[PDB]
DNA sequence: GGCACTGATCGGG
DNA sequence: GCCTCGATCAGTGCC
């Protein structure tokens, strides 16, 4: 078919600038402080003129600062990119009777009934971009091909504020020429793996019998990656579906004594029923996020819906099942539902 | 043998 | 850091 995929420009710091122009042409870093101490916690993300000099999400937000002390740091505000977020989906909407909410930022449209040809759903992506300066002053990048992974390959090759078609010929050269570890889904962890097994472009997973390739990273990524290397990668557009919500949250020092986690446990439950909204789950999970930063979590699914009260009581149920089966110090603590009604 | 679960992992935003 | 984060894996109960 014919795959048309957006996605919105450094977004969280773009929204802080539309909402205050202040800061255009200004370094601006978006941070999520967690509350141990000034400073502490993570980059979220940074517009360009601080992502230039190597201030980019998910570092120190004490490194960011070391680099560009003068920046702009601003907390995050979710809710608020959220707003901005779900308006814009409701203007690609009309673009497509078949979208797919990738993100809080990213979306792909099927527009195979509403153009022949490249050159046509070019010039739909460039109509798709003014209608979301014009409504919402937000810029976007656009990527175009034959499926979804070469469309956002596309938009990937193209930002910011781009627009690019991988044509037919085009995919049959990344085929050849394109980096494994730029293909979608393949992760540091994956891509040394491949690597280890000399696999470097996707022409390679061809050659390579299926058992090394199944063996080494897994039946699902080796059917994956073998459907790109043939050309023959079809995925649909569909829906997304919310399959889980949660809350975790940073304690103020390690701890395994269950009065001192409770507070935050608790705390974690009732933002999470806030954002369950009118959703009624049937499992419950309790995740810790150890010092060492791994993560390990319990569950318990109800043939019946949870209620808050319920959930309070299973909640410290699984949280004392974590502290036997694992003698780590817990540095987070929250939950997520599940199984939704 | 293979389906339905579970917690851990991996890739990603 | 936190997820309006989901898919897939190995280990297992089960038919
Ligand atoms: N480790 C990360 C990565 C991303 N995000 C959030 C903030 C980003 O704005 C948004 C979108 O991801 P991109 O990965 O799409 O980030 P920008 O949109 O920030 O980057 P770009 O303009 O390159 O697309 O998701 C986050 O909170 N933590
Ligand atoms: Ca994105
Ligand atoms: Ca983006
Ligand atoms: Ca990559």
Do not use: W
């Not at 940074?46 to 702009?72: C, D, M, Q, S, W």
């Not at 499926?147 to 990937?156: E, L, R």
């Amino acid at each position: 078919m014919i795959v048309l995929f957006v996605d919105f420009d450094y977004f969280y710091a773009q929204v802080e600038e539309v909402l205050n122009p202040s800061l255009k042409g200004k370094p601006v870093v978006v941070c999520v402080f967690s509350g141990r101490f000034e400073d502490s916690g993570a980059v979220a993300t940074a517009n360009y003129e601080a992502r230039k000099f190597g201030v980019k999400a998910g570092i120190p937000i004490v490194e960011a600062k070391k680099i560009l002390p003068n920046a702009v740091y601003l907390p995050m505000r979710k809710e608020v990119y959220q707003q901005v977020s779900s308006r814009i989906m409701n203007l690609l909407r009309e673009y497509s009777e078949k979208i797919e909410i990738a993100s809080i930022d990213e979306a792909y449209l099927d527009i195979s009934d509403k153009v022949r040809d490249y050159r046509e759903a070019y010039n739909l992506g460039l109509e798709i971009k003014n209608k979301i300066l014009e409504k919402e002053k937000i810029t976007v990048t656009v990527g175009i091909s034959k499926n979804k992974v070469f469309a956002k390959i596309a938009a990937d090759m193209a930002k910011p504020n781009g627009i690019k078609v991988i044509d037919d010929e085009e995919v049959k050269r990344l085929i050849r020429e394109l980096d494994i570890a730029d293909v979608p889904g393949i992760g540091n962890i994956t891509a040394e793996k491949l690597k280890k097994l000399g696999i470097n472009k996707l022409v390679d997973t061809l050659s390579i019998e299926f058992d090394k390739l199944k063996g080494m990273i897994g039946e699902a990524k080796a059917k994956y990656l073998i459907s790109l290397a043939r050309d023959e990668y079809n995925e649909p557009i569909r829906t997304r579906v919310r399959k889980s919500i949660g809350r975790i949250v940073t304690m103020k020092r390690n701890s395994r004594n269950l009065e001192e986690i409770k507070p935050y446990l608790f705390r974690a439950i009732e933002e999470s029923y806030y954002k369950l909204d009118k959703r009624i789950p049937k499992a419950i999970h309790v995740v810790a996020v150890t010092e060492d930063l791994d993560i390990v979590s319990r569950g318990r699914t109800f043939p019946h819906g949870i209620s808050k009260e319920t959930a309070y009581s299973e909640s410290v149920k699984l949280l004392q099942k974590i502290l036997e089966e694992d003698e780590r110090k817990i540095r987070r603590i929250g939950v997520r539902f599940s199984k939704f009604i």
